[PDB]
Design an enzyme around this catalytic site. Sequence first.
Site, PDB file in Angstrom:
ATOM      1  N   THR A 188       4.137   4.274   5.649  1.00 22.67           N
ATOM      2  CA  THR A 188       5.058   5.295   6.125  1.00 22.67           C
ATOM      3  C   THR A 188       4.616   5.841   7.475  1.00 22.67           C
ATOM      4  OG1 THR A 188       3.962   7.214   5.139  1.00 22.67           O
ATOM      5  CG2 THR A 188       5.308   5.846   3.691  1.00 22.67           C
ATOM      6  N   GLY A 224       3.810  -6.965  -0.263  1.00 22.07           N
ATOM      7  CA  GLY A 224       2.688  -7.859  -0.136  1.00 22.07           C
ATOM      8  C   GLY A 224       2.485  -8.711  -1.374  1.00 22.07           C
ATOM      9  N   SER A 246       8.818  -0.326  -2.498  1.00 19.00           N
ATOM     10  CA  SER A 246      10.008  -0.934  -1.907  1.00 19.00           C
ATOM     11  C   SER A 246      10.173  -2.333  -2.477  1.00 19.00           C
ATOM     12  CB  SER A 246       9.890  -0.978  -0.389  1.00 19.00           C
ATOM     13  OG  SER A 246       8.885  -1.894   0.009  1.00 19.00           O
ATOM     14  N   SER A 301       0.845  -1.184   0.000  1.00 23.21           N
ATOM     15  CA  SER A 301       0.000   0.000   0.000  1.00 23.21           C
ATOM     16  C   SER A 301       0.885   1.241   0.000  1.00 23.21           C
ATOM     17  CB  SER A 301      -0.922  -0.011   1.215  1.00 23.21           C
ATOM     18  OG  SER A 301      -1.798  -1.124   1.169  1.00 23.21           O
ATOM     19  N   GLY A 302       0.576   2.193  -0.883  1.00 22.55           N
ATOM     20  CA  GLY A 302       1.480   3.315  -1.100  1.00 22.55           C
ATOM     21  C   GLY A 302       1.745   4.121   0.157  1.00 22.55           C
ATOM     22  N   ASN A 326       1.772   1.441  -8.980  1.00 21.11           N
ATOM     23  CA  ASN A 326       2.336   2.234  -7.893  1.00 21.11           C
ATOM     24  C   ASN A 326       3.197   3.329  -8.510  1.00 21.11           C
ATOM     25  OD1 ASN A 326       3.343   3.216  -5.434  1.00 21.11           O
ATOM     26  ND2 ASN A 326       3.391   1.159  -4.536  1.00 21.11           N
TER      27      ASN A 326
END
Lengths: 714, 370
Positions: free
Chosen positions: A172, A438, A216, A167-168, A212
Amino acid sequence: AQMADFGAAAQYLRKSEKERLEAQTRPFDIRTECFVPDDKEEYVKAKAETENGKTVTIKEDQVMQQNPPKFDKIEDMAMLTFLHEPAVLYNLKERYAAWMIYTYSGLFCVTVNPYKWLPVYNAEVVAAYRGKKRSEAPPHIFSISDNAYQYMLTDRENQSILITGESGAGKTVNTKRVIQYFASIAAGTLEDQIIQANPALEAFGNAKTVRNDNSSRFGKFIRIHFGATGKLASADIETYLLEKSRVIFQLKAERNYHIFYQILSNKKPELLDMLLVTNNPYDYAFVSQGEVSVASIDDSEELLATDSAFDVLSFTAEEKAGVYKLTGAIMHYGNMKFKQKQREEQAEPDGTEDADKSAYLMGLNSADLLKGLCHPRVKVGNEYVTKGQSVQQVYYSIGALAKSVYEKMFNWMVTRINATLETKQPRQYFIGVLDIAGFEIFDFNSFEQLCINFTNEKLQQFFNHHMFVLEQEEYKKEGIEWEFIDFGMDLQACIDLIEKPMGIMSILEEECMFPKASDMTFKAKLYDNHLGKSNNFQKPRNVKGKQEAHFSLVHYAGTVDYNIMGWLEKNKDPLNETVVGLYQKSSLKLMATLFSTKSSFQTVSALHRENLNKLMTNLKTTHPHFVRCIIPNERKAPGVMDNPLVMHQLRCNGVLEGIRICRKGFPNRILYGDFRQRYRILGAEKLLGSLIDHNQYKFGHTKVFFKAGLLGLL
Amino acid sequence: TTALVCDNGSGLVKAGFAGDDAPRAVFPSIVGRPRHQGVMVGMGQKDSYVGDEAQSKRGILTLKYPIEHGIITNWDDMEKIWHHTFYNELRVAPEEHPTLLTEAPLNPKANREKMTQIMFETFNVPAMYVAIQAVLSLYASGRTTGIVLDSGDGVTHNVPIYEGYALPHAIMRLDLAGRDLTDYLMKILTERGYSFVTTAEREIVRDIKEKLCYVALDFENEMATAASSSSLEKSYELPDGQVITIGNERFRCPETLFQPSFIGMESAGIHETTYNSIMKCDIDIRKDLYANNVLSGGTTMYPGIADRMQKEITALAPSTMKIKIIAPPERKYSVWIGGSILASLSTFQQMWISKQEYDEAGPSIVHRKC
Ligand SMILES: Nc1ncnc2c1ncn2[C@@H]1O[C@H](COP(=O)(O)OP(=O)(O)O)[C@@H](O)[C@H]1O
């Protein structure tokens, strides 16, 4: 009572008793309100005759009877009676509408990005969770972190935090807030220190993915250390397996790691001239396979952020220009051109301009480079003999060289950062913060997706083992006699055929070594070994209108289809030890520092699998704690989630697996007094000796256990 | 668990682990025993030296090869050599590694039966397998089709293979190899005055052969050239001084491969037996055989052997085919490389001969099924 000390945040953490008690008495029927599928919602309430704004009549064994309104805002779906997809879906929808972005799921912790500033984190007025357990406080992740503190202190055992990260956002902010919590509890801080040099990882291990724009492509496992008594120490981060095949090959509408394009932004001409490099990306193949730029981000500001990161780090002029030289040389590799020697089978060079660039850059010789690439040498017993090479073999060598250069440079920067954030007295204990990509289900799945899915498969089986043993413990606790086939391992041990040295990736390397092997031959061998002899292995349903797949596997995240075209090019890594020796002597001191420390067989599959097993051993020695971040909507608007996107997410997030497994309970485990009071309409021996099946319960030590589908009657 | 590859050959043991790029141990397949008296009490004289330890004490020993023409003719010496290979060169325990042995085609069955019996009884290998040197050479060349010409120390053989199918009726085996060339050189050097008769001197002559000999593209005018000038003469220094200079012997030694009548043999040259093996195959595959002549083994390492071979086969074949001699620069270890590739395959792990199959079937298990 115990919540009003959260004040303005109490409304978010746990509503007042009034709206809840008026919500526990809603008039709803068990035989006139079900769930049926849908085209835009995929799941809707209804009244077989069904109406909710749209009418359909379907089979009577596909409807989902809606949950009882006694439980219609409980933050832990482990106590409901009707455990099914739309139940959990609309439960989260409702608890998110009446804003409570936090949720318990059996053993997970499902949180949703609210897109809205909330004082639910600050100030400490909410961070007062000190000393409490998870079960009693409102369902906040800070309570989970406090439980981790208590556990690591009371057992002297390391702990683990596994969040879903593809998830973007939400990844964070959640990492930030939990690490801030840990800074607070065991008290230019270490969080400042972490987020200082993070642009390094952002620019080296992140690239635009088709779904996206900052992903990562590696695993981040932060080790935040504590004193022997429980005072925070310095924190060293650990990195793991990287999707390094990205260095050479990229699909359409994607690109490899940012740093190439950041540099290529033509921002600082000193670099573009030191690397003898132009600004056109379509002249360097290792980056120009997909898209050369995404308009969702500028590259100049990225270059400047990375420069700032290099400055705050202990890097000198050489520890920055040398890395730039390494990247430039990797890019100048991309257009090295060779031809067969006339009339014979041997690669011969044509033009050496790029060879000159690379030899000057890395501190190497042009002739030495060219010959050592064109004439590999082996240690045969106690002698040396040259090896001949076809062109494709030398191209394999070039790609492997670039990959290894990039990989070791990355690892060395990791060690450098870990050093720069380390100055502290001798420590003992720590908490593991495991960030990981994920599951992936795209419209065109490929080999890298197979790798990532296998990683996630291992992690999910790991979680299932954990939850299995904890449930078995709890069942032994109440003297509840109930035994079952291990939910943690056996159901998935059969879908790791890929690891058995006759399965998919095994046969893949087997073909990589097999001469003249083609993707058709590979498909033939696969079908020989697995078609029909495996239930999870099935033929894909290629209906004209989509890209063709070649096989289909049933994972825990559905049934996945892959297309095997080009996989030999993805897996082969024949490393050329001659140029390795060339590297180990180069004048560019960074090259030597990288490659300081009686070959032709290395496969990306092998290294990938071994790093995965290494990380698995890293985990299995500790105690885990899970987190599930969700992006509710793609338009980023707060308040409303788009249900098909979130439903696919939750499918791949694996919480539905926990739901399916607790369905094999007895997920509902209640005390005697609560059920005795709530259902006294006529100590529990007499109350349930009145009436259904007698396996529906297991009476032990003031605990009643219920299978899902029983309290929809009460 | 990893497996061992132990290409024996009649002149050089090459052992190693399945999965490596090159053999870990390469030493002469030789066993030496002392001839002379032994006078220094307490020197601790061994009974026999094997490998390259027998090559440094060469001067006082008498050397014997336990393999003559691909056939093991001294089983105690072969047992010594295997014991050495396992315990002193590789430094492993044979009880924990399957072993892949190699053998030339068209040699007696008792050879393989005894190999199997020795391995399983006096080494307790968990499993073993006996491949064919030419098939492994093709594995290492990276192709599934071609006529491979293997020429080691004892035996020269062709095996034509197409799409992974061997043509066993077209396999042709010849019994002149490196050792017969060494002997012919020992005999041809006497007409200049140099006399090598000892086994140690045979090793010296083998070194001369490996350092100074080449194949002449055209034998007759090369002979006339050597007769006219003296630009072909080179010099070699024996290991006591005493330089020797040789002239046309340089190319007369390996010329025997193309005119085996020099040593009184009746066969045809290697070019002609290659062509015959091709012309014994089905007319539809020989065009693809003509273009994949794979060379292997040590005796194919002379400078100019690929050019002479291509010239001869081109002169024999029709004028429309493309003759391509494939001679890798490392073809001396092609058999071992291919053997490691084979023993590393996942689909091969069911082809081993387990200890239990042997216990059931006897030593005859080897050729009867595998
Ligand atoms: N560079 C060379 N030039 C010519 N002949 C060679 C060379 N190297 C080895 N030989 C010959 O090859 C033989 C050994 O070759 P090898 O392939 O090891 O045989 P085997 O496989 O039977 O042990 C020796 O008899 C030697 O005469």
